[model samples]
Target: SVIKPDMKIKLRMEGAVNGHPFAIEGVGLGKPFEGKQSMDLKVKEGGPLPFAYDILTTAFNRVFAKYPENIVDYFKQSFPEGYSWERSMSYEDGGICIATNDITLDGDCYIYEIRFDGVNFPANGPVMQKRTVKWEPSTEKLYVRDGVLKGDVNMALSLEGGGHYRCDFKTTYKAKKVVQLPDYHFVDHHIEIKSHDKDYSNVNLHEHAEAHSGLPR
Candidate 1:
């Protein structure tokens, strides 16, 4: 069972950019886990700062993408004609929300796909961006064991900037420490990201967070 409807989840992270140090932190709270994220970014002037900043921002935004709204609101669009004709959420520009194809209960782990019709550029641009988040664990973190919530964190973010620019971060957590409060519970956790390329190497990260209920129980 989920925690009482009032609790929140918090997280913090610190890392580096091409040998320069930085930090990232966020809170997953609210009715359906909407989140607030922050980062401590710094770079030397006129020394690849623009290039590094862009890469950092892209990775940060994608890794912390908002969790979907509550299941009710999320699936409401799937049932427009009496719950028979299920469909994905559509955008004004012919884009649809991405859905998870892998199932944990069924033992399916790897999920993969591509989107070509979602390109919004007026000119000829295809596969504008191809990104994926693959969890070796094959599922989301829904298990609470031994007073902790455990899961994996694996993400890849890419953008089509003349060529292809990609940033991938991978890790796993033993658990998020859970604490009982007077009215609700709070969870705290952290993760790390290291550079895979030597050009942008020596990037070490640490994240910390604390989350609580929105309203007292």
Candidate 2:
């Protein structure tokens, strides 16, 4: 059966009880699980062990009760939010390739957005470059908990202006590696796709990254 209250189940798969032979660590107690990951066996005593959450709730309440605080930084120190964390294909597309990566947080919910300003091609009119994506996984909530985004993405530009830009390509989102801590928050992972027609010489998109941002670098 599962782990009980009084009963604690602990197992060392490889059976290393001799104080760990070759201790792999940055310091004394570094990372127990180095390269590979290990399973976690937590106690499931009656509800969910919410007794400790008492302090967490109190912590949040006392913190928020201290007056609603808010901060913004689109340039630097963009951590708890506000920054480019998504993959993008941009440069000079007859005009400046200025795109925005927006994800609004109201009621502590996910409401994302992506915009491409300054456009106009020779022929085909722009479909919709203002793409938005968001997710709130690791939950068992109501029906509208999950959201699916739809967009008519347009990716057509001159070979010279849009060197790295793909032509009518599709997006392929990658999964983010989530580590549980407190309530929520995850290390955001982004994805993108490009054309196969190679006209680019040795030019690469590996230029630079915004300070403390998860976008291209």
Candidate 3:
């Protein structure tokens, strides 16, 4: 199961970080969503980092992954109608922060972009990190393979613990649908994010063994 072309979808969102929360909502095609996605909204009442990445990521993945499935059924749902998008706005002490969304035309091709707004999150405390992404499909998934997202990560000393920090990060999503699963119904398609970075900022404790006992940086 993979998402096909001409598949239309919409997103509604709001986010908070460092205590500041902002709201944004919209609907459109999946392919055209790339350029249309962003967080240039009202920065009137500034807070921590504009929005919370934990809330944004959780809501987004739940909505797109479930599709014909209900977000509430899988987990305590709040998306679909009560979701928001957000990411790190500035890196910590010169570190880098990046996020991206990409979908293919068929099953192997996709057009995508990965952006780093230079935001960082703290392992021991709170830091505002900001970033965003959106996409739409016009024809098919196979038509977008030539698309790509490339960028760099900035590393600098952290003021909190005096260790070098790097927000190196990446996110990738592809359209996939299933026609012959086992149970479910309808077009069981999905959009998702894949990440690859050597930094410990966003990795799980079990992902890299070194992160288990290494000094906080």
Candidate 4:
């Protein structure tokens, strides 16, 4: 599903390589998101690149794919009280970092909020060889129509390495729910696209043959 003429979905990419900053802001195209949905969020002729831009785009894509039946139902069922009930990953780097939520609507589609303030987790290890990684996010907002999703996630993340790769950015993405998720590889990062109901059709592990072997690691 793509953005119809009556709708508008925006995106923002602002990051710093070692605390120096670079940014790109644009609107999004439609359908299920993959890598670069917004061409305007591109590298300048010789300017700084949006670090982890593709990876993060795919991450948000995962969020969109699962937004409907899974995400909404769970919030309604398990954490209907919203913010008071926290999904703690603090021990999980996985958590020990936590995810707090606020649900604005049910049938109006939804105006949802997920926040991660002062979020601390194990993003990586010392050797720079990627291991069990997590992320640091500030806040997220996802406003959904009955069929489409329009929202943004603002993040100030620090990579597990030292000072060099501290990342801070925001991604406002717009896409529709996909019955059949894209038959491609998502980023090999920490985010996982887990289908909540019994529909296993959306899971694909094409490029991660080494670690996952496609059977789900």
Tens digit per residue, CA lDDT, model 4, 1-217:
1112122234333433323354434333322222112222333221433222322222212222212222332122222122122332222223122333343323212233434322233335211123212344223444444433333333333444433223333332222223222221222223332221122211221111011112345
Q: Per-prediction TM-score, please?
A: 0.25, 0.20, 0.25, 0.27
lDDT of 2 by residue, 75-181 (tens): 11222342232223232334222333443233322223433322332223221221211111111111111121111123333222232332321222211222111
Ranking by lDDT: 4, 3, 1, 2
Predicted structure 1, TM vs. truth: 0.25
Superior by TM-score: candidate 3 or candidate 4: 4
Best by TM-score: 4
Model 4: worst 10 consecutive residues (lDDT sum):
204-213
Give the Cα lDDT of each candidate: 0.26, 0.20, 0.26, 0.28
What is the lDDT, from 0 to 100, of the residue 47 in candidate 3?
A: 22
Q: Model 1 over residues 102-163: C-alpha lDDT tens digits? A: 10111111111111111122222221222221111112222234433232223222234433
Q: Against the true structure, candidate 3 has what lDDT?
A: 0.26
How far residue 213's Cα lies from its native spot in candidate 2, in Å, is 14
Better of 1 and 4 by TM-score: 4
Candidate 3 regions exceeding 4 Å error are 31-90, 94-167, 170-217
